[PDB]
């Protein structure tokens, strides 16, 4: 089954590196991609970065395209380098799951089908604050 | 009494024309193209380009 | 931000307000305060695992049919949010969400 696990430091000094980390247990390679999201200051929900199974890069413009986040898969982790921080996104991470669903209504040789996802499993989250 | 006609914006999902050809009938029907016009041709080697 | 919904436990069936086009691919969601959520329906037809056979979802067959989801019997959870997180072919990417579909009751 899948286990979640927020590990964050919480306090952390602004325009510093910071390091975010959860846990999935029992779990296979390149079954399923991963992603996060943020409920915090109390809104709707907001997206950030999804990085494939190949440590590539296509995240939320919504945000500045500022945060480097995990690929790591050492043991069990997905560490989240934030750079230059500033208050306006300090936030609680939740480690989600995240999955690619293919929809077809025409020809596929044509180059005519797009790429929705899903999200079945979320994390609970850690409070992180900037001081 | 001069009504233009004109191509408004395509509602619903976007769509390319194409047209559709039996892929196994097609090719029997041209072999059999080539091997009579081999006759005609000195039983040469036909290619289409 | 518009305050929305139903109260009170007389149930009904809400649809969010994009309009149907091209081709929708809706993923209904049960919000959860303070944990994790659980998504209802995906692909709008297959059910996830477990879920009871109420929570339907409209089919996407004679293209110019609206999005609709029927409830009944409500927990706290159908007392929160419900999302509207459609993907269309012409829009591309659908970065936003959807509306979100605050229950507010007061006995
Ligand atoms: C010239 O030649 C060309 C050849 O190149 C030819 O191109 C063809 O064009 C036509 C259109 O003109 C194309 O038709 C479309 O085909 C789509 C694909 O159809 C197949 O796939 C679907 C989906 O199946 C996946 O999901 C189900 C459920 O989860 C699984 O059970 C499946 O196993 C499968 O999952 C696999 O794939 C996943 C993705 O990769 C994997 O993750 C997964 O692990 C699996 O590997 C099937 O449903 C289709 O089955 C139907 O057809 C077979 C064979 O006839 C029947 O036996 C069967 O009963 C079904 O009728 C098929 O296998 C279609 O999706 C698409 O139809 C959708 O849209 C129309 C509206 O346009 C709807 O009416 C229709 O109902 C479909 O909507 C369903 O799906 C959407 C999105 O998923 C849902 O949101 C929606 O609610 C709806 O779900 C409901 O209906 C389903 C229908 O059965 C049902 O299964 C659901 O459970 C639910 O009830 C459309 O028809 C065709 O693809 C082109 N072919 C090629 C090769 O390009 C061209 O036409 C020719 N020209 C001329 C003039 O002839
Ligand atoms: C071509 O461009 C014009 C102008 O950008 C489009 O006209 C707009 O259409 C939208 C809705 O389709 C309206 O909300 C705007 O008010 C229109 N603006 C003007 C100036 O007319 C037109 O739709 C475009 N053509 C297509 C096929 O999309
Ligand atoms: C074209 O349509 C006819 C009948 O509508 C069908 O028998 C034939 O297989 C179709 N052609 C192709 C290439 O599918
Ligand atoms: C072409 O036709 C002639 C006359 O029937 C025959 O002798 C010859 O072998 C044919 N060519 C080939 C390559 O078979």
């Known amino acids: 089954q899948v286990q979640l696990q927020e590990s964050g430091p919480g306090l952390v000094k602004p325009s510093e590196t910071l390091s975010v980390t959860c846990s999935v247990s029992?779990?296979?390679?390149?079954?399923?991609?991963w992603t996060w999201i943020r409920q915090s200051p109390g809104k709707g929900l907001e997206w950030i970065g999804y990085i494939s199974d190949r440590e590539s890069a296509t995240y939320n413009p919504s945000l500045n395209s500022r945060v480097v986040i995990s690929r790591d898969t050492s043991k069990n982790q997905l560490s989240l380098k934030l750079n230059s921080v500033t208050p306006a996104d300090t936030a609680v991470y939740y480690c989600?799951?995240?999955?690619?669903?293919?929809?077809?209504?025409?020809?596929?040789?044509?180059?005519?089908?797009?790429?929705?996802?899903?999200?079945?499993?979320w994390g609970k989250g850690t409070t992180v604050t900037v001081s | 009494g001069q009504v233009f006609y004109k191509t408004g914006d395509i509602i619903g999902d976007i769509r390319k024309a194409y047209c559709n050809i039996s892929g196994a009938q097609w090719h029997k029907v041209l072999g059999r193209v080539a091997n009579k016009l081999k006759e005609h041709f000195n039983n040469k080697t036909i290619v289409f380009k | 931000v518009r305050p929305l919904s139903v109260a009170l436990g007389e149930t009904a069936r809400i649809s969010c307000g994009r309009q149907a086009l091209g081709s929708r691919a809706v993923q209904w969601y049960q919000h959860r305060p303070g944990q994790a959520p659980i998504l209802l329906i995906y692909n709008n037809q297959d059910r996830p695992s477990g879920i009871p056979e109420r929570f339907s979802g409209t089919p996407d067959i004679n293209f110019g049919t609206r999005a609709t989801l029927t409830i009944s019997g409500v927990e706290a959870g159908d007392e929160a949010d419900y999302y509207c997180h459609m993907w269309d072919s012409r829009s591309g990417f659908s970065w936003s969400f959807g509306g979100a579909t605050r229950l507010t009751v007061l006995g």
């Open positions: 989600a799951t995240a999955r690619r669903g293919q929809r077809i209504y025409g020809v596929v040789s044509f180059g005519e089908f797009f790429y929705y996802y899903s999200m079945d499993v």
């Open positions: 029992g779990d296979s390679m390149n079954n399923y991609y």
